[model samples]
Target: AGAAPAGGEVRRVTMYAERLAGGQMGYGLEKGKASIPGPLIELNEGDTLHVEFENTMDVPVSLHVHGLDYEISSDGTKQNKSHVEPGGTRTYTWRTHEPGRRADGTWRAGSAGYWHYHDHVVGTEHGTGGIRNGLYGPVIVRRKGDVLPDATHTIVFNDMTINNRPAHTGPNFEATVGDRVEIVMITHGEYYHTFHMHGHHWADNRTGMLTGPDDPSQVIDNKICGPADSFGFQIIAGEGVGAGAWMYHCHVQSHSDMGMVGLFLVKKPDGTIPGYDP
Candidate 1:
């Protein structure tokens, strides 16, 4: 086990919802630079994050995050009536708790899990109008003392487009064989697709690594992700496969043919991919 302090930290941040190029709306930590899938907000269990969010679009929007403790006032839903008006601002609070015994003496689970947030569309053109935009992001709450990875990347499936881009080639992990890599996968489309990464496999459990012998989580390569479902897993970059440009793709033919493809270039010590061509 690695050394890490017990979580109990409070932090504050600013977030904005605005327009991206290609006719998309997204969330940004700063203005004039919004990513399709927004920014990743990471936290340790038993911590708190207060988001000073501003909706910069002409239409009303809200931040509806998943798997964290927040008051009903921060639920950000149309039915909940927590949507933020255009050009309005609000402070949404997200707090995480630890896994401990409850009053009933049962082993309670913590809020350390892969989660996501998106806009609850609060406005639409009166008639014959469409809302094709990006308004989502990733959030991760890790348990204390968990084996941290060398790098983390977020993959969000929005329709056939990954992260609302032509290609989903994220930042490559420039790591050696034994380096740990984390992938945060989230889905936002209507259909479910199987996610498969080449060469490496991960345990189907919390953190994508085994907790103990009693865990019994299966070691597998691919899994299905549905609308609004998100998960994360870690893999040692060179567990069974050598250095190469490995592939990660959606196994669904419609999505795969729809250009759902990406690569993870695991390099060698000499700073070269062994089997990669010029």
Candidate 2:
């Protein structure tokens, strides 16, 4: 865990898009180094981020974020004329606020949760080609006292692939026992899925923690979600269980059978999973 950043700060971030193998595209902090699921964007609740985005590809693209506050100019839609043309550039401003009452004294919600972004102008104006090709990433806005993890991972259930990897090839994650691990789970594509992590559980609420003695949120090990749905949580690796190769996968029998599966390699202090290799 680390200290929280000062709230209400404005930061400038530069990002660019490039083509990967097999028709996939990705966003990166710099040129020539992009991956599936794009980049992990972590922020505090009361900060504003200006993404100076560049389109390196020969096609139109845009940055569209979900579950945050922004103006129409940053809508990142073709219909709204916010998309960036080839070799063109623009800045998308994303703003977040802490939870509280409005100036009008009504209740308002904070911008702290798991969210995602994608290209909105690729191939069909719906960004179908871009998203299917890997133009999305995870975003997390945190409250002041939210638990910070020792490590973070992104698990995107995009159709039959996890982070656009082949079946059973493992976009797998590793952790040391007792290490605090945060997982950002996002879904996209045609079918709904139940995300399941073996030997671990989290509260089915914002921040994924039981905040009080009377916390009403359910602790769940699996969550069913549809396209574009996103949620996140943190757990101590091998909390009650020992080090092992734990499976994290789509709980639907057909989906799991269809190879939508991966492993969470929880290792002991010696950095080895008991009875596991490779």
Candidate 3:
């Protein structure tokens, strides 16, 4: 079965994202930074998450927990009556309930996966402008009966393009033989992102648009092609797998070349390499 339920009262952590270097710069000189700590929230099924947020930015700030079935009270939407005014603070308490499968009956949370949080304020600093800059992390909700791989890793993708180039425009995601990998790609904002992996294809459980298959989480049954959209992939690497630098980028040709690309290397087995050491 599972280990004894984690004891101890729900811990409350407080963090602030203010006018720091490279903030949103919404308007005036220092518009304030789009900051949020603990995007990678960890909790066993049924655990409680008491998150307190402080918005010291010049503009209004709000947070929406993606994928979680939260009640309107805790939904973090202006219409839902939850938000944080500039220089103000707000607290949200959520019970980390297990993810429900769609009508297709897909398995959710294979091993540890990824999730994200962001500012949902509309008509203002929203989407990438408020998130991509770095207001996201991996929300790891460990499965009760899932067996974890030897090691776990997290890769946070960025859509930012440097030198007028796309971010993650280079090859990203390489693994040694026998390494189990789970890559979580969260849309920092509204832009579509295509996450390509070398070696193996991972499972996915998201609807194409706002809604689709309602049963099982859908796995990419086919090869993921261009026009990187809003979805993620699971990949395995190593033996019998291509050994080389694999490149992944937004299918948007211009975006990839611009800077939305990255690379991952799957080294051969038994090969000692630099930076391979733990």
- The numbered model that scores best in lDDT is 2
Candidate 3 lDDT over 1-278, as tens digits, reads 12324322465756454543544322111234322332345555556667677777776656676654456777766776686778887876655555557678885542223455655663454433555444444455544544334333444444444112235444344567567554545444344445444345544553111123464545553333221122443345553655665555555667656666665566777553334432
- Measured against the true structure, the TM-scores of the candidates, in listed sequence, are 0.92, 0.97, 0.65
The reply for model 1, stretches above 4 Å from the true place, is 1-4, 122-132, 167-174
Q: Is candidate 2 or candidate 3 better by lDDT?
A: 2
Q: Give candidate 2 regions above 4 Å deviation.
A: none
Instruction: Show model 3 residue runs off by greater than 4 Å.
Output: 1-11, 24-39, 99-114, 122-128, 149-175, 188-190, 205-234, 268-278
How many clashes in candidate 3?
A: 41
Q: How well does model 1 score by local distance difference test?
A: 0.80
After superposing all C-alphas onto the true structure, candidate 2 shows an RMSD in angstroms of 1.1
TM-score of 3: 0.65
lDDT of 1 by residue, 113-231 (tens): 88998876644421001123778889989888877778888887776767777855543345677778889999875678888888989888878988878888898899998878888
| Order of the predicted models by TM-score, top scorer first | 2, 1, 3
Give the Cα error of residue 212 in candidate 3, in Å: 24
Better of 1 and 3 by TM-score: 1
Q: Cα lDDT of all candidates, in order?
A: 0.80, 0.91, 0.49
The candidate that achieves the highest TM-score relative to the unseen native structure? 2
Give the per-residue lDDT digits (tens) of candidate 2, residues 1-278.
Answer: 76466478898999998899987899998888888989899889899999999999999999999999999999999998999999999999999998888899898999989999998889887887888889999999988878789999999999888988888787889999999999999998778999999999999998787898899999999999998999999899999998999999999999899888999999999998987889
